[PDB]
Design a protein around this ligand. Sequence first.
Ligand SMILES: O=c1[nH]cnc2c1c(-c1ccc(Cl)cc1)cn2-c1ccccc1
Ligand SMILES: O=c1[nH]cnc2c1c(-c1ccc(Cl)cc1)cn2-c1ccccc1
Ligand SMILES: O=P(O)(O)OC[C@H]1O[C@](O)(CO)[C@@H](O)[C@@H]1O
Ligand SMILES: O=P(O)(O)OC[C@H]1O[C@](O)(CO)[C@@H](O)[C@@H]1O
Lengths: 442, 442
Amino acid sequence: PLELTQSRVQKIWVPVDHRPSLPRSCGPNSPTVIVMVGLPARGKTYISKKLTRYLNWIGVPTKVFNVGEYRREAVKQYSSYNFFRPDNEEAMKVRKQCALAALRDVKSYLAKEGGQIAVFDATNTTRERRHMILHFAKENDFKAFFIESVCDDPTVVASNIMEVKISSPDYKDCNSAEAMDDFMKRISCYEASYQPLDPDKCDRDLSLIKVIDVGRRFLVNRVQDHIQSRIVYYLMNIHVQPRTIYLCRHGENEHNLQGRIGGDSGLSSRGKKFASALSKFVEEQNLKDLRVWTSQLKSTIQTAEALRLPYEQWKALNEIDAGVCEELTYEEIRDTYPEEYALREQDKYYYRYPTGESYQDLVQRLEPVIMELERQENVLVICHQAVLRCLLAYFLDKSAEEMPYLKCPLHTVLKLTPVAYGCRVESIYLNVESVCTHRERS
Amino acid sequence: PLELTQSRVQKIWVPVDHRPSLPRSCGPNSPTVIVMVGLPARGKTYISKKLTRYLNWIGVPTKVFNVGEYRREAVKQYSSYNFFRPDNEEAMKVRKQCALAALRDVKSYLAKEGGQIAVFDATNTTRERRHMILHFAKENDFKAFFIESVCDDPTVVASNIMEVKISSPDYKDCNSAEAMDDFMKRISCYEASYQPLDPDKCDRDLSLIKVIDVGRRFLVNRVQDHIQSRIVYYLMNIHVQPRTIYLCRHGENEHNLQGRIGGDSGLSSRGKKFASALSKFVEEQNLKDLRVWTSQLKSTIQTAEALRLPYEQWKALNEIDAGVCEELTYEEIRDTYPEEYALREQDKYYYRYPTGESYQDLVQRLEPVIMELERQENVLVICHQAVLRCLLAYFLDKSAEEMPYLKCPLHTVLKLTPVAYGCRVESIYLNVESVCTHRERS
Ligand SMILES: O=c1[nH]cnc2c1c(-c1ccc(Cl)cc1)cn2-c1ccccc1
Ligand SMILES: O=c1[nH]cnc2c1c(-c1ccc(Cl)cc1)cn2-c1ccccc1
Ligand SMILES: O=P(O)(O)OC[C@H]1O[C@](O)(CO)[C@@H](O)[C@@H]1O
Ligand SMILES: O=P(O)(O)OC[C@H]1O[C@](O)(CO)[C@@H](O)[C@@H]1O
């Protein structure tokens, strides 16, 4: 009775599966359609992309279905705002067909591809369009959650057009002035039929969030579940204010020199040289304010000590726990635990060290770090190889499969600048020698 | 250069403090005054108490300053709603003095007692009163965050009067009908001067949350920092729907029999008997729906396996990590690590095991568990001794000092029923023998 076995890769206790002669599968909670609402240049695509990046990173399979991309596919080349005219009978039919084709792909993603969240990125400015999306959701047993972005500031609208609209494939043959002018006319095509969400009377029973004036204010109505609550929390923590995220590892430590994993060793002579080089680098950046974050492990704290700046220690930033393999070299791991060594090499993201962690566990631990990084402005995170790969995979939208192999060398600062729909990444090697701890897949 | 030392109790790396002949202290971010807003019987005290319980448990020193308690102290016995009349010149002076005395204690708590959050629990229904609180906050360099509870449902108002108002010390000599009638008249005294928060025009620059219709809808304006964002997230996850929380440990394991700590041992013969007894108990509770949560450790999973109910494994529910002391008996800990043994006995909450955890680390790990427990209805959590003490300290509002000593015996279900401003706790021993793992302070 109650016989369990521990799965070799993830180390999960499962009931001993003495399946009968005819083993049965029973494969595989309700998926969600996130409905973007609002006029063009309201940051709907920005919200869609960023939210999808966060949801995928935390392990919720998410995909964006942008109706404009279906339109660029159906219609050869973009001519002008005339395509978006309410009196353009033909283009209105094409645009409806594109929205229906995107919804068809939403159904296939959620019901047949193991997707959990589909972000329907369109204007969805009319009650008619939204009623149709609701009908589609109800008939397919999908939940519907509306995210409306409301902003009437012309400075914000002009900034969005300049930052990411003029550079759109639609405006390839256009100069900045013509593209901006055409886009303003394009916005005007949607203004007459636009019916904002009304949670007070009409949309009282809908699950929604109204993001007002670039996240200055929020109207939240009927949050049904865990995932909607998480989305709301995320939207309330992110901002579009300019800032820089600097990510680096502690300076080279004594375990690095011996080729040993984990432990709590101190900086080597080179590691101390990096720490001084980092102080000079930080000083040269001339940042008004800078928050410095470290792990609770000695090597990151010693590195921060060289900066002569206040810093905060996070236990969540501590290197991946290697369990029984802590303080061992990779050669000693292969010779003492050959089965464990091979299992990790085959499934590096999901592999859990015995009495230790996986990269998957790291993500769960680092979620509060990410949420706080979003809230903050200029931040320097002094951490460890596996922790750094996880954070970098979040900022650079890298998959779980690529994450354990991202290059994060010692004595090198990764300068992240948020621009358009992601991060510009600059690498700055601080000219101090160290050992190489990067190991490619085999 | 960069010399650090590890603190004996918490195991935190600190700069080697070679203080000069004259060591200097420099003792000790801006505190927050949470302003409750709304008519009586709107759950302001419920919000105040619950939020304070959560904030203290996560490690943010928080205290409630209820103006009504200052009034019960200044005015001998309560007579009737006549005391609350707007034309009652004398009582209006007394009530103002009570609010000012509470604010005086708010200043002393935040500026001189190391308090981080002061919850000002009063009606604060007029712009005049709120302007005065803002002036008080600005002059003392305190942040102000407003929490308004808006509800016009008479069923909700009557329920609040019946649940917690009629049982108030004010209505000691009154029967349920007279107390209810007096309280309705008391509410009416505040209705004429009530000016709700207006984030649209008047209160546009104030940091606030409007909780509408018992958390059905929210208006969030200008969330300035981390703590306000956390409060908003918490308020959006809690509910007042009836439910039961059952908490228990895994059935007795092999390590329990050997007096060994940590590890991942399986159920003993008695532990398996408890698991069967738990299934019978669960069945007898006749719960429409029940969510079952376990840790990722074998003993809790084997216990859940006996229920024949779907369950979810949480790594956050895994027992406290004893680091180097894992799988050792307490006798072996005292003999191999006597310094460590004595340090723990002296400071059980903050003590961190070498390469392991503290009860303080457990709280940080269990925060997502608590947030999900709040969202849910009927939940059974099968966990471990230290994890259980932490969760119980949250529900029962126990301090960090009492937390490591809470009695959580094996083969015993703790049935938690939310009622009034906290939890009713029922203990159910499932009549299966086990060893005793409880150790009192020495
Ligand atoms: O509300 C907007 N209106 C116009 N533009 C916008 C936004 C937001 C935004 C919306 C909601 C939230 Cl919680 C945060 C940011 C981002 N952006 C944006 C700006 C420049 C480039 C790309 C996107
Ligand atoms: O909004 C209310 N109006 C009247 N009463 C109320 C509430 C809330 C409440 C308010 C906000 C939130 Cl996020 C959750 C619950 C709780 N209570 C309550 C009910 C019975 C006894 C004690 C308290
Ligand atoms: O996932 P990988 O490639 O083993 O890298 C993580 C390892 O790297 C180290 O930071 C040492 O370089 C160890 O602490 C950790 O076990
Ligand atoms: O804090 P205390 O009293 O040592 O209790 C926690 C210990 O109890 C155990 O659950 C064993 O009873 C251990 O796993 C853990 O180390």
